[PDB]
Amino acid sequence: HHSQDPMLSKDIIKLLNEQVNKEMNSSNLYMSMSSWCYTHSLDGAGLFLFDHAAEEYEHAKKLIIFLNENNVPVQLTSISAPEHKFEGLTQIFQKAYEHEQHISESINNIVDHAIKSKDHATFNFLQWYVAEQHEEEVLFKDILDKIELIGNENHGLYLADQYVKGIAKSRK
Amino acid sequence: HHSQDPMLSKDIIKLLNEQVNKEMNSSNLYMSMSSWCYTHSLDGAGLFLFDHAAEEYEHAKKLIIFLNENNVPVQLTSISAPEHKFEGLTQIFQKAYEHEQHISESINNIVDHAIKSKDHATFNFLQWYVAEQHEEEVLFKDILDKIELIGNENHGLYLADQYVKGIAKSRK
Amino acid sequence: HHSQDPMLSKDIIKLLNEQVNKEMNSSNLYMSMSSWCYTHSLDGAGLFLFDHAAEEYEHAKKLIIFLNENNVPVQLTSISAPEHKFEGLTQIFQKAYEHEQHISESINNIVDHAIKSKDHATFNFLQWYVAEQHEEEVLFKDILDKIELIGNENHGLYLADQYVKGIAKSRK
Amino acid sequence: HHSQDPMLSKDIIKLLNEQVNKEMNSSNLYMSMSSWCYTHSLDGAGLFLFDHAAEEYEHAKKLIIFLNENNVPVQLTSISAPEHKFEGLTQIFQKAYEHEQHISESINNIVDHAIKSKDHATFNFLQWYVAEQHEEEVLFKDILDKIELIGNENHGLYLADQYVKGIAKSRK
Amino acid sequence: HHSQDPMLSKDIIKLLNEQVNKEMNSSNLYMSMSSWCYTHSLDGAGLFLFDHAAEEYEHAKKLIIFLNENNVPVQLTSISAPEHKFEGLTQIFQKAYEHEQHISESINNIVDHAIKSKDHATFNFLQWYVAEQHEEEVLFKDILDKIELIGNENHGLYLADQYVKGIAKSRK
Amino acid sequence: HHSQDPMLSKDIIKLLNEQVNKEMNSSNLYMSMSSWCYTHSLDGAGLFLFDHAAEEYEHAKKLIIFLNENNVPVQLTSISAPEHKFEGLTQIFQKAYEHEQHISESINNIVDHAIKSKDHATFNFLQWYVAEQHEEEVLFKDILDKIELIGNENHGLYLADQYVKGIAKSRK
Ligand SMILES: [Fe+3]
Ligand SMILES: [Fe+3]
Ligand SMILES: [Fe+3]
Ligand SMILES: [Fe+3]
Ligand SMILES: [Fe+3]
Ligand SMILES: [Fe+3]
Ligand SMILES: [Fe+3]
Ligand SMILES: [Fe+3]
Ligand SMILES: [Fe+3]
Ligand SMILES: [Fe+3]
Ligand SMILES: [Fe+3]
Ligand SMILES: [Fe+3]
Ligand SMILES: [Fe+3]
């Protein structure tokens, strides 16, 4: 039997498939960072990062749903192993914020390509993703700001972890 | 600062970490199978397999939570690129059933090792997973039985896909 | 058309089928004991034993459901007629308690084999059955204890039957 | 102590005890037919026949209750293994319908003997059973009619089994 | 009058009686640790440890109930006086965590013995206890981790005690 | 850091600590008596005495709370191994009543010392304990009266145990 051709252009198909991969890779990076925190007495940051990991996977799933509805094959390649060696809480959040900046850039790139190719169905679909990613990037900026304001001396790590724990619980 | 040692034995840690990566590999395989179905007009099977993929990731997350609570570092590997090419609906479900049989075996192995090492916290924890996996294995057996009962003559594929669609919708 | 192979091992299949037949035999035995009580003015014990007989059939049905879901043929065998002649209330409950001890042993044997063969789906499934049988064995121990505490002399049978009637009604 | 004599005549006692045993044997037959269906990918018919088996045991219990209340000893006979080998769905339901006709005839015989002996307590008691058996006989006639209308070629078995599944679920 | 024999094996009887003693001894150890905290301005830890003491006694009672139901004599020996001299909060929680590890080991031992003797009624009964003890062991690991993360300098003790106070209140 | 001195006098501290250990000794004695009853078919008395044992521990806990709030270190001793062997139901309740009389005397002694030393916080605190102990002493007097009124001829033990069972159930 004949099935209809993919409804998206080759370039958009490529970018969206790559984005699914990026989000799956992100989820595993955040699981790794979360585990580091849990095994170093930082269960507040552990919980926050675990829940964020799960959210990145939810983004991957929403992208997959869009590809499916457009008859676009989801061609999954490998998901690269995440970074696992970390120096401390500050470094983890520095790396996390940098990572979120990279993800924001990748989304801007897809949206820009959608505009150039006049693919406004894709442009329109991506708006929840733009908005949610901005909130996530701002959140990591804010947490990093707070970690650096507190520092790691004189119960600093404890205070920072409890701060992050509060955020984790409030977002549930 | 000093954090407490992992609360599980080396062998149990190895098996559980391997299981996390098994579930992640499985999840992406099911996403690939799901996409094949969606792009070949089989949206019932597409939906069923997508929802199953999501559930396998939920299993991975529950295993991660247990590792975290036991102060065990999670070792996230590179996730395999899944098979992209399939012959048809029957082949997909034959492959899936065989795969679920192998997952069941892997869980039986961990539970067995837990008994041998007298790790009854782990034995007790795994019981939800034993029960859920059994239900999943039976489900795939039932779907395969039905696909083979219907066959792919005349409107056979349509009938089978609609059957699977009904199951997918009933489970959510 | 092709149907999938039984999902359980040959030894486990044999033990489970034997158990179904054991429960059916138990139902008949208890119906016979119940009738003896009813025809000898012991309607309290009659009711208790009738309801217990029905519960043993419920166990048989639950085991059958498990065999069915695993694509295991149910093998219902020839069973002897139950004993119909009894000496009195004490003898009936002595025989019943001994019978429940035998049933408990038979279940312990299946669970043990499940562990040995690493069949943890069956191990997990049987846990309701282990728990319910334990409750039943304790119950028969308690009733036999009370029958022996009361005795057979002046109004003893009446007091014992009313005690058992109370239990029967409270379990409804 | 003295217990009152059976309240029913010897002939009625014989017929009622025979009927209890008939219902027990019927339950076993239907469990066997159900198992055949489940192991041959016909879970709709499997469920229907399992539920019907359970209903036949319920009939046996109601007859037993009546015997108990009349101080009539219940005489349970030996069980012979039910037939376990069958040719297919149509043959199973052909055999089942013939079986239900036999059961209907047996009940008609008891009611006739109740009239002849002026045992109107028993006549009155049996009315629920006459009514329920009639409904069951009509049901099996209807299912057999549908199986024969559908046929066994070109998805026929699937369609028939799904039809029977619908009935099974609607009666729950 | 004759009472039925104990329903458990001699080895299981011994282990369970010893376990009742262990839990009673634990309750008194935790009362002693609690008192130390209360008399050293650490009422958060005082409350937490008092409530935990009460919970260990609840475990002893549940074990006693199981022994009673199985007609097993509860043969209580002395409860050893608890340790009472402590260096500080960290040492108390170090000792407490070590103690919980010992208790977990003792439970694993009983469950292992139940498997070896095929006493699956006891195995099944102990599952709530395995699960609850694991949660308790994890809890003490977590609190010790937090105490060591905070330390005892620069309001450290106050911060740690307030942290533990929060946990105590949340578990009520 | 400096913690405040105990808020009670040396003599009151001694008496209260002795009372805590008296209640713990009592609790285990009642557990022993309860077990004797359960293993000799007297589950009514078994239940009553178990629940009473649990209540005596509750009294110990309330005394501990008062010591804690007054910054008084609790001195937990080794708890005596209770008597295991008893002659019968009557002897158990004679021993229990005599024991409750001695507990009442011990409480009267503490209250008297509180008056003599002008410790009215302690006098006031003990009032719930005076009241509850009086109710308990009266209860044991009443049960002993009833056991002696019934006697242990024919079904006497059964009647007495059922009487006590009614009291046990009514109090919870
Ligand atoms: Fe993000
Ligand atoms: Fe994102
Ligand atoms: Fe699975
Ligand atoms: Fe799985
Ligand atoms: Fe058709
Ligand atoms: Fe039983
Ligand atoms: Fe049973
Ligand atoms: Fe019928
Ligand atoms: Fe019938
Ligand atoms: Fe514990
Ligand atoms: Fe414990
Ligand atoms: Fe008292
Ligand atoms: Fe008292």
Chain E interface includes A41 (CB < 8 A): yes
Chain A closest-CA separation from residue B141 CA (Å): 26
**Segment holding C49, helix H or strand E:** helix C43-69
Nearest to F16 by CA among F3, F5, F7: F7
Angle at D139 between CA D134 and CA D144, to 5 degrees: 130
Provide the CATH number for the domain around residue E165: 1.20.1260.10
DSSP code for E79? B
Q: Which residues of E touch C144 (CB under 8 A)?
A: 4
SS (H, E, C) chain B: CCCCCCCCCHHHHHHHHHHHHHHHHHHHHHHHHHHHHHHCCCHHHHHHHHHHHHHHHHHHHHHHHHHHHCCCCCCCCCECCCCCCCCCHHHHHHHHHHHHHHHHHHHHHHHHHHHHCCCHHHHHHCHHHHHHHHHHHHHHHHHHHHHHHHCCCCCHHHHHHHHHHHHHHHCC
Q: Do the beta carbons of residue E28 and residue F76 sit within 8 Å?
A: yes
Residue in D143, D71, D67 with CA at minimum distance from that of residue D110: D67
Task: State the Cα–Cα distance between residues F162 and D158, nearest whole angstrom.
Answer: 61
Q: Exposure of A116 by Cβ count < 10 A (0-12 exposed, 13-18 middle, 19+ buried)?
A: exposed
Closest to B162 (Cα-Cα) out of B53, B50, B46, B55: B46
Comparing C-alpha atoms, which of F38, E20, E74 is closest to residue C141?
F38
What are the distances in angstroms from CA F56 to CA E69, F29, F30, F59, F63?
A: 22, 10, 9, 5, 11
Secondary structure of F57-124 as H, E, C letters: HHHHHHHHHHHHHCCCCCCCCCECCCCCCCCCHHHHHHHHHHHHHHHHHHHHHHHHHHHHCCCHHHHH
Rounded CA separation B165/B158 (Å): 10
* Alpha carbons D163 and D143: distance in angstroms, whole number: 9
- Position of tokens 């009553």? F48
Distance D40 CA to ligand 1 centre (A): 50
Is E57 in Cβ contact with F3 (below 8 Å)? no
8-state DSSP, C79: B
Binary contact (A73, B35; C-beta < 8 A): yes
Rounded distance between C-alpha atoms, residue A116 and residue A9, angstroms? 12
Cβ atoms of residues B100 and B137 within 8 Å: yes
Burial E55-82 (b: 16+ CB within 10 A, else e): bbbebbbebbebbbbbbbbbbbeebebb
Domain count of chain D? Answer: 1
Cβ B119–E108 below 8 Å, yes or no? Answer: yes
In chain C, % helix, strand, coil (3-state, to 5) comes to: 75, 0, 25
3-state helix, strand, coil in chain F (%, to 5): 75, 0, 25
Closest by alpha carbon to C36, among A7, E139, D74? D74
Task: Report the residue of chain F nearest C154, measured CA to CA.
Answer: F154
Cα E135 to Cα B66: distance, rounded to the nearest angstrom: 11
List of chain D residues whose C-beta atoms are within 8 Å of the C-beta of residue C28: 24, 76, 79
Which residues 6+ apart lie within 8 Å of B102 measured at CB? none
> Has F56 been labeled as part of a binding site?
yes
B49/chain C closest Cα distance in angstroms: 20
Distance, in Å, from the CA atom of C75 to the CA atom of D81, rounded to the nearest integer, reads 8
Contacts of B41 in chain A (CB under 8 A): 1, 3
How was this one solved?
A: X-ray
> Is the Cβ pair E111, B118 closer than 8 Å?
yes
- Is residue E72 within 8 A of residue F54, CB to CB? The reply is no
- For residue F167, how far is the Cα from the chain centroid? 17
Rounded Cα distance between B139 and B55, Å, is: 14
**How many interface pairs between C and F have CB atoms less than 8 angstroms apart?**
22
Q: Is E108 on the interface with B (CB under 8 A)?
A: yes
CA distance A41 to A52: 19
Q: What distance in angstroms lies between residue D49's CA and the mean position of ligand 8's atoms?
A: 11
Resolution (A): 1.5
Residues of C in contact with E4 (CB under 8 A): 97, 141, 144-145
Nearest C-alpha neighbor of E108 from the set F15, C49, C63, B118? B118
Residue of A31, A32, A51 to mutate, testing the B interface (most B Cβ within 10 Å of its Cβ): A31
Residue type, C103: I
Residue A100 assigned to a binding site: yes
Cβ-contact C112, C6 below 8 angstroms = no
Amino acid letter, B153? E
Instruction: Give A53 Cα–ligand 1 centroid separation in angstroms.
Output: 9
Cα–Cα dist E140/B139, whole Å: 41
State the DSSP code for E2: -
Give, in degrees to the nearest 5, the angle at Cα A32 between A30 and A36.
115
Give me the sign of the Cα torsion angle B1, B4, B9, B12.
negative
In angstroms, the CA E18 to CA A64 distance is: 57
Query: What is the per-residue DSSP string for A51-108?
Result: HHHHHHHHHHHHHHHHHHHTT------PBPPPP---S-HHHHHHHHHHHHHHHHHHHH
Q: How far is the CA of D166 from the centre of ligand 9 (A)?
A: 21
Q: Each residue of F8-38: b (16+ CB within 10 Å) or e? A: beeebbebbbebbbbbbbbbbbbbbbbbbbb
D154 at the B interface (CB within 8 A)? Answer: yes
* Residues spanned by the domain of E92: 1-172
Q: Tell whether B131 lies on the interface with E, counting CB pairs under 8 A.
A: no
Report the alpha-carbon distance of residue C127 to residue C66 in Å, rounded: 13
Give the Å distances, CA to CA, from D170 to A140, B103, D44, D166, D167. 54, 35, 12, 6, 5
**C-beta separation of F86 from F38 below 8 A:** no
Closest CA to C43 of D57, D66, D61, D71: D71
Q: Rounded to an integer, what distance in angstroms lies between the CA atom of residue C55 and that of residue C103?
A: 14
**DSSP code string of chain D:** ---PPPSS-HHHHHHHHHHHHHHHHHHHHHHHHHHHHHHTT-HHHHHHHHHHHHHHHHHHHHHHHHHHHTTPPP-PPPBPPPP-----HHHHHHHHHHHHHHHHHHHHHHHHHHHHTT-HHHHHHTHHHHHHHHHHHHHHHHHHHHHHHH-SSTTHHHHHHHHHHHHHHHH-
d(CA F117, CA B14): 66
| CA distances from residue F72 to E168, F9, F123 in whole angstroms, order as listed | 21, 10, 17
Report in angstroms the alpha-carbon separations of C146 from B94, C139, E1, E116, F27.
59, 11, 10, 33, 27
